[PDB]
Design goal:
By secondary structure, the protein is of the alpha+beta class. The protein has a single domain, classed as Fusion Protein Consisting Of Minor Coat Protein, Glycine Rich Linker, Tola, And A His Tag, Chain: A, Domain 2, CATH 3.30.1150.10. It contains 4 helices and 3 strands, in the order H-E-E-H-H-E-H. It is elongated. The structure holds zinc ion (2 copies). It comes from Pseudomonas aeruginosa (strain ATCC 15692 / DSM 22644 / CIP 104116 / JCM 14847 / LMG 12228 / 1C / PRS 101 / PAO1). Belongs to the TolA family. This is Tol-Pal system protein TolA. Part of the Tol-Pal system, which plays a role in outer membrane invagination during cell division and is important for maintaining outer membrane integrity.
């Protein structure tokens, strides 16, 4: 029965860890998006409907060490504007709130999709 109690408990933790997990990753992806939006300098060719995926590379202390296009929007100036915006954020020390294994698994190399309209939505400070 002890094996059985364990499953039950394991199923249980896997439920909560995933609801908590999703709130965390949601909150951190939101932070990335907002910080990149604040840095973004929109190019004349940007349009609603575009999407660029960028691979963001970080250290556990939150320093960003690289950003590159993982899937192009089809418009090279928008693509480049997203990569520059990422690099310009500089650091996300908020990452230090993660246990290291979670960092390493999810945020050391992370692909985020950026859209001009969402970057414009969040481009203000305060
Ligand atoms: Zn505005
Ligand atoms: Zn502005």
């Amino acid at each position: 029965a002890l094996a059985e109690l364990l499953s039950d408990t394991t199923e249980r933790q896997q439920a909560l860890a995933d609801e908590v997990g999703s709130e965390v990753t949601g909150s951190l992806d939101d932070l990335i998006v907002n910080l990149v939006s604040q840095q973004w300098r929109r190019p004349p060719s940007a349009r609603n409907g575009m999407s660029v995926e960028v691979l963001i590379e970080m250290l556990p202390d939150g320093t960003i060490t690289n950003a590159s296009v993982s899937r192009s929007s089809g418009d090279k100036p928008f693509d480049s504007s997203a990569v520059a915006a990422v690099r310009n954020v500089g650091r996300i020390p908020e990452m230090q709130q993660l246990p290291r294994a979670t960092f390493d698994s999810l945020y050391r190399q992370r692909r985020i999709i950026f859209k001009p309209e969402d970057l414009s939505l969040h481009h203000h400070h305060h």
